[PDB]
Amino acid sequence: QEKRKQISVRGLAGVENVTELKKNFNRHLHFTLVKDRNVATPRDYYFALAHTVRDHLVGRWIRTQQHYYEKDPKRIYYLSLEFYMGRTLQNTMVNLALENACDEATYQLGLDMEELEEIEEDAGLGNGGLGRLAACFLDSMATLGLAAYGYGIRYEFGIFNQKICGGWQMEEADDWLRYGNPWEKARPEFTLPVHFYGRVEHTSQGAKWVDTQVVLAMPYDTPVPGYRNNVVNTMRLWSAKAPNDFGGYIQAVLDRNLAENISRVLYPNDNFFEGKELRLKQEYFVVAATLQDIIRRFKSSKTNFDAFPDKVAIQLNDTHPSLAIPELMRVLVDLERLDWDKAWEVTVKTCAYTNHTVIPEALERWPVHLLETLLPRHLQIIYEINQRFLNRVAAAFPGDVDRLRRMSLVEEGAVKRINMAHLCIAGSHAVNGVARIHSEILKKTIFKDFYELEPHKFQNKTNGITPRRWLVLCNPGLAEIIAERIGEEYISDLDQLRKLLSYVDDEAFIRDVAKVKQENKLKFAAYLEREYKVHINPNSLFDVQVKRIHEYKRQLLNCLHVITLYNRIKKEPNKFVVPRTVMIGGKAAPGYHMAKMIIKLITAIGDVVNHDPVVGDRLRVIFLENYRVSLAEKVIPAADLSEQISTAGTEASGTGNMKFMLNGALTIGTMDGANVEMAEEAGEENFFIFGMRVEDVDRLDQRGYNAQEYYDRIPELRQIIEQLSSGFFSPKQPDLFKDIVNMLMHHDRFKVFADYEEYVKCQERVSALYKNPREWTRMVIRNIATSGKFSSDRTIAQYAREIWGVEPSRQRLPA
Amino acid sequence: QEKRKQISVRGLAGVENVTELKKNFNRHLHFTLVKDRNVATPRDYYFALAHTVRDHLVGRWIRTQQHYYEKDPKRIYYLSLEFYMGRTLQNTMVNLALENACDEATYQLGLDMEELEEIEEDAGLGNGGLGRLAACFLDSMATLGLAAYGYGIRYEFGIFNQKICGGWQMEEADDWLRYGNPWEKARPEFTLPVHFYGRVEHTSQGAKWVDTQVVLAMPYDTPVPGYRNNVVNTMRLWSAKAPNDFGGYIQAVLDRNLAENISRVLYPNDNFFEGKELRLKQEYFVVAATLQDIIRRFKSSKTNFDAFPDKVAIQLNDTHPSLAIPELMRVLVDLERLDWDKAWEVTVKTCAYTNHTVIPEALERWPVHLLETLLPRHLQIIYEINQRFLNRVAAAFPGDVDRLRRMSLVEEGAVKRINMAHLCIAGSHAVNGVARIHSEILKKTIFKDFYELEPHKFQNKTNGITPRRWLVLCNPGLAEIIAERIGEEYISDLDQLRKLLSYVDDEAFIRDVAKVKQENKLKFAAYLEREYKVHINPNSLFDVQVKRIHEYKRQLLNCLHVITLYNRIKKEPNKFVVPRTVMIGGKAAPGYHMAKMIIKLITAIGDVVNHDPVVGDRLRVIFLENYRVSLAEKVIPAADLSEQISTAGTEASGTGNMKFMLNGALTIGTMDGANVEMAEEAGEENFFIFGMRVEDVDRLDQRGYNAQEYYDRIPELRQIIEQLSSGFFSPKQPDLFKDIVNMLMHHDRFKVFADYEEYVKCQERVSALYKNPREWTRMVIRNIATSGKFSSDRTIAQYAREIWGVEPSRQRLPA
Numbered sequence A, B: 001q002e003k004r005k006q007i008s009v010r011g012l013a014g015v016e017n018v019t020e021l022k023k024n025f026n027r028h029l030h031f032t033l034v035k036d037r038n039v040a041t042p043r044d045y046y047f048a049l050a051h052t053v054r055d056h057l058v059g060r061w062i063r064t065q066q067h068y069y070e071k072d073p074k075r076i077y078y079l080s081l082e083f084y085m086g087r088t089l090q091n092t093m094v095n096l097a098l099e100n101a102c103d104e105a106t107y108q109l110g111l112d113m114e115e116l117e118e119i120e121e122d123a124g125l126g127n128g129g130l131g132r133l134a135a136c137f138l139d140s141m142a143t144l145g146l147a148a149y150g151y152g153i154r155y156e157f158g159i160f161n162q163k164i165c166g167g168w169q170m171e172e173a174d175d176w177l178r179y180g181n182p183w184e185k186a187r188p189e190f191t192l193p194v195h196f197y198g199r200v201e202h203t204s205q206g207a208k209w210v211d212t213q214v215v216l217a218m219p220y221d222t223p224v225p226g227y228r229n230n231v232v233n234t235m236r237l238w239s240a241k242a243p244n245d246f247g248g249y250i251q252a253v254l255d256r257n258l259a260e261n262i263s264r265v266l267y268p269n270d271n272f273f274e275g276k277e278l279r280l281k282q283e284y285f286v287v288a289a290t291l292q293d294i295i296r297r298f299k300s301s302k303t304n305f306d307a308f309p310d311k312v313a314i315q316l317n318d319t320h321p322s323l324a325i326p327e328l329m330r331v332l333v334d335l336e337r338l339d340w341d342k343a344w345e346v347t348v349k350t351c352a353y354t355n356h357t358v359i360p361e362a363l364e365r366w367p368v369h370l371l372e373t374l375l376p377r378h379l380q381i382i383y384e385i386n387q388r389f390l391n392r393v394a395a396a397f398p399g400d401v402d403r404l405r406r407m408s409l410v411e412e413g414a415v416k417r418i419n420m421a422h423l424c425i426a427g428s429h430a431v432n433g434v435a436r437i438h439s440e441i442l443k444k445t446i447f448k449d450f451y452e453l454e455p456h457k458f459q460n461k462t463n464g465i466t467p468r469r470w471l472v473l474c475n476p477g478l479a480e481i482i483a484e485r486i487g488e489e490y491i492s493d494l495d496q497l498r499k500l501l502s503y504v505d506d507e508a509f510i511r512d513v514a515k516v517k518q519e520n521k522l523k524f525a526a527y528l529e530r531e532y533k534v535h536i537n538p539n540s541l542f543d544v545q546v547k548r549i550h551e552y553k554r555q556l557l558n559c560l561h562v563i564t565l566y567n568r569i570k571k572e573p574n575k576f577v578v579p580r581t582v583m584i585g586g587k588a589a590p591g592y593h594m595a596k597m598i599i600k601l602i603t604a605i606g607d608v609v610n611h612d613p614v615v616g617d618r619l620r621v622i623f624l625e626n627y628r629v630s631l632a633e634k635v636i637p638a639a640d641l642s643e644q645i646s647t648a649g650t651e652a653s654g655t656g657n658m659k660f661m662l663n664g665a666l667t668i669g670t671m672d673g674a675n676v677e678m679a680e681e682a683g684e685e686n687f688f689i690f691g692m693r694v695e696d697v698d699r700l701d702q703r704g705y706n707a708q709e710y711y712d713r714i715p716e717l718r719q720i721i722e723q724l725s726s727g728f729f730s731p732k733q734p735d736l737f738k739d740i741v742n743m744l745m746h747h748d749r750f751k752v753f754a755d756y757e758e759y760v761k762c763q764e765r766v767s768a769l770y771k772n773p774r775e776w777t778r779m780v781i782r783n784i785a786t787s788g789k790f791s792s793d794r795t796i797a798q799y800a801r802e803i804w805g806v807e808p809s810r811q812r813l814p815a
């Protein structure tokens, strides 16, 4: 398409730039891929272009890191077990102003760059929100000119590739490195030792960790480009490698796999803790290798570690890298020979912890036996930390033994465990939630005792998304029509979107806003046909719930509504209803049974709804296979209605909600997480807010949630439960959904029936406004225009000023 | 050193060529390695140069393979489980005439290219002779313009890196790909399925192999340059990969390792069969993937497979890829649907087998149960092959049931097994030994019954070595002085070395020949000091035995001589003897106990000899650690005396013997293998030939080898055995060498004591001639000058005309 090359926000196709791009495209095709045009596949062409484009990163990559050496600013180390990065090619081109040039260059070579882009595998090294937040954060940190380093693990296999088979999820390994990763640079020369198991000997000069098994940590460095500032930061991902030295010789060589299994696969759990030793090993591996790099870089700068927190910030993405606190102490005390108290002064000032959930099954609580075996010296240090910390509690609250037991890092029981959130709080100067309501809920509940001891520690940092990936990349049509009115500065100053409120009554913007949405919808519809032979009605309302499958996110509530629409159609076939394509998508953790049942229910509903000739194209329900960052970039720009329907108090923030707001969808949701702040930014009048508020959930809990009451009082709801029990959605297996029915009736922690009625009526209001295109689009304008707060640039600037103590900059580097 | 850049056989340093080399060196340093000069290590500089040099291969690589597509010549597939390739960088530069240019280019950048070369890891994907023959063969095949493809396995770990610790061998994994391989091109797009286990169902149209576990075979292609002919052939090495589809999900991902273990490590056995299922899997993996490529290329050329043997030659390097015979039949019968007899016509005409040993512990005899489980359809086919083959025996020799049982592919016993040599003979049109004596010994003994049935099958192909690696690369000084007299054509026409017999009385050549040897010796001496802090006397005779540690190669015989020299010195301290550095080197297979004892004995002798102040620098015995192709290239040019002392009839050919002859060493050896032909080429008067001849070994076997006789009749020998028994060479452990003593006295298959006396006296003749420099050097000239026959170019030309049916060419391709 030539129209796309006329998108100004995609930059200049300079005649010489084009000429050079083609020359280097053809150079990589010959020397790097060893192909000629006669045997070259699209995949080769994608790689030629990827190599060509990565070459443009290299100069800035070297100069940026030298700049940091020269200026010696405080360094931000963002430790996370996940980096949900997605694809890199388009992102590279946008941040380097090369998109239109590459598009013209490939066009002259007879190629469609859009097709080439689709050959790239996602770097799916995350589960969901926490992982994708880390990716967004790296991008914003680069755009804000921070000396910032992402540190994590190079999983051989990312989040599993989901296939739906028989209506059921099947998992297949995500072999994302099969054809190579052209972005990363392997750094074997900078390999570091990590120790495991062993024993502690307390000798003359103190403790010594000995008799340890070594696993080498090999770093791969990936470039992280800011938005047109000539800044390229580094994401460093550690890969596990058997040590150089040592059933026989053959077996010994084979057994090198055991150690190398630590970096093999992402644990595919979203918001759920599994106490597997391999997972614990992964956490120590990232923390140990990462902290050796930080100490070395600290020493090779302009030992006295009193200035370590002036030059080092370690940000903990959840408790997953929590061992960085005992590990930093270990290095400082056992190897650098610092007194414990100075070491602890340094540690607390250097470390800060970000919490992502109040849900108990997600919080890390490691058995002491496991910590004792695998990391004996760390357990010792944790116990010491706990004694001095509880001593402070005692002195602050004399005689409150109850607070002592509650605040202990050590949790008593049949199995003694270490509470890793407690360790983080004790060992960090800053603790933040990711949305106002969540940060409030932490100081009033889960962490209230810690808030009372150290109020000053507790902060809020409302999550954000990068408007590069999540607008310019994914929705170029919308970015353009915005740029035509207000220019391009908003791309790294998203609060400038408020200027668009001046256009609520401009007929061309109203027309253009709707036209872009139509275009995104036609393109997504076409996508399902070619890739999955699925027919969807492009003049239907696109109702999308995409996110990991969960009880607390209430995909089930969405199911109940969908079946309601179906049954209402059957009772009154002749009555007009706004046509709808209900799209639900997301992965279930492989061991989460309810989530796999929920996926099966969505498809089972589809099997009835989509083949009923009375319904026809009035209602269609499809399960979007293999939801991942690449598919988010397709389906979200195409969405009319954003489903954000978690039980009030359960979704700490959400980030999918913000992506939908940024891309021209209206939101139907509870007052939970950032939904609260999104409605405050836009006005509640521009959101479909429904359901119980947190305080209402509490009152139910106070008197007990009896699901039976709602079933006995709501005829439409009872009908649906009867259809599920008796086997209307599973004729060949009538009892198939009994577990779903049983949880809803007797063990529903998330109170789906209690929001059922308000939800259904709120959906009626949605349909009503959809019948009025002009006013739909006008309310959409009011949303897009107030979405600026939810830029990750704002989030990061806040981290920088309020926790890290660094001042962000958007000034370009010379290049 | 500037002198080396004045070596004409290293080509022109063209001013523009130099300029471009530096530009691309600096380009790879920046864009490929992402370094600058301030942080660049030697290793980076080596990689920049490797990348730069590999770029010069690419154009010829593509054009050569297109040339083969266009002309459609018969294709040679050299199947081997080993490719002992060594380093590639210097070899690339010599075959492309880039050596002096790169040397000047790196010099102007302030770099020593010789230092850079030493950072390259060997591709040590072989054990010894059979492996290095395959490497030599690929090089000659390229130089002779044959459409030839090396096919094997990309082992993750090659032959183990040997460390001597306490006088003992220790094995460490050969992590040859730790910092990457810049020569190979990964080809994931050409991945192929290989099947294992399963069952056979005989249906309508015939048999079907079903219920199989799949292992993907991923090819990596390495360039193979001929000598200045613009030809670049391909070595394709298969790497094992878990299939795309499927204790839980985590465990399933981890368990992908099991399948990927097939390409993990070379079995480090030299001339020894180990019936491990993993080894069998390796053999099938290479044969199955390789034959799918051959069939596909056959079909994509200008199905009737009557012309398959006109377009395809499969050469089997030992019985290791023997399954190619049942596998080709399987494809032809079960998938292409050809009648068995036409399929068998095709198979025999396509396959040929090369035998490398007459020793029984080396020959492959696989248990039928193992073949039945792992490859059920192959076993079926083997049985059928055996029936029709034995039917031919029966018809040729009616009533000889004894011949039937002896010639059977099936060997009866407690465990029934398949004899893989027998399968090869039955399924191949050509069977060759690798030296005249060995090829004769096969038709008179091991394979006499097969020779009687099919005389026409049995050939000789005396082994060879490439004069590129083994003269021009490793000994540039010698190549030059040769080139000054006769020019450069000899480098690919080695028989031209006979012209050097005209110089036996030329004083400058005599001077120059000796001067080069002195230079190689001083350089090797310096090597031991820097890398191992070992002092050797450069005015001593360099007595070198390098090769895998073996009973049959008789390193022990060398030990006996060394101790004799030591004891003779002690009895008569004042008596002059020619100073000697005895150098023994080689790896023992990890499970071969005697070989590990032999290594310990060599070092133990050193511990006495090298610290006796009466001996001083008159005698020194050192064990050369980690003998591999790179070290062969150093030590052999430095050698005065080549130890080739296998028991007559045991070493099929040898190739180390030819490397020493080519590089200016005189040979002390038995009449075994190619030693017989080397002495015929030079004249026995120019070789130190000693010991029993094969017929003498036979007579001993006829009456029984009683070691006691030699001990009771030879005082000097009895003394040494007493020193070994009583613990003179092991004071802290007197009984340490009892196993050696016991084998020599009672279970010596290789009759060391029977050649002891003739060996010792032959060594006296060696020392005597060494006292006369002029006549030493003159005899060396007579050796170098007659070494031409032992070029692998001659060997390969013979394979091509006498087995493959293709005419070699040394004409350059346009480029």
Ligand SMILES: O=C(O[C@@H]1Cc2c(O)cc(O)cc2O[C@@H]1c1cc(O)c(O)c(O)c1)c1cc(O)c(O)c(O)c1
Binding pocket: A001, A114, A115, A118, A474, A520, A523, A524, A525, A526, A527, A528, A530, A633, A634, A635, A638
């Ligand atoms: O199905 C079409 O695209 C798919 C859907 C889609 C989207 O919704 C948003 C987005 O950011 C990208 C995107 O890439 C999809 C796509 C998939 C392919 O396999 C492919 O080859 C391609 O060019 C693209 C399509 C159809 C069209 O008819 C068309 O003209 C076009 O440009 C594209």
Ligand SMILES: O=C(O[C@@H]1Cc2c(O)cc(O)cc2O[C@@H]1c1cc(O)c(O)c(O)c1)c1cc(O)c(O)c(O)c1
Binding pocket: B001, B114, B115, B118, B474, B520, B523, B524, B525, B526, B527, B528, B530, B633, B634, B635, B638
């Ligand atoms: O020890 C020296 O080389 C080593 C021995 C050696 C050899 O015997 C033959 C050969 O083909 C190459 C060869 O490379 C060796 C070597 C090892 C190194 O670690 C190294 O840095 C190097 O430049 C080289 C040496 C000493 C010298 O004094 C010298 O001038 C020199 O050029 C080289």
Ligand SMILES: Cn1c(=O)c2c(ncn2C)n(C)c1=O
Binding pocket: A269, A270, A271, A272, A361, A550, A589, A590, A591, A592, A593
């Ligand atoms: C019970 N359960 C699981 O068993 C689970 C999970 N996420 C992953 N798994 C395995 N969640 C959220 C959960 O509630």
Ligand SMILES: Cn1c(=O)c2c(ncn2C)n(C)c1=O
Binding pocket: B269, B270, B271, B272, B361, B550, B589, B590, B591, B592, B593
């Ligand atoms: C007995 N034996 C072994 O046990 C052996 C070997 N090569 C390897 N091994 C393990 N050889 C040659 C051998 O004779």
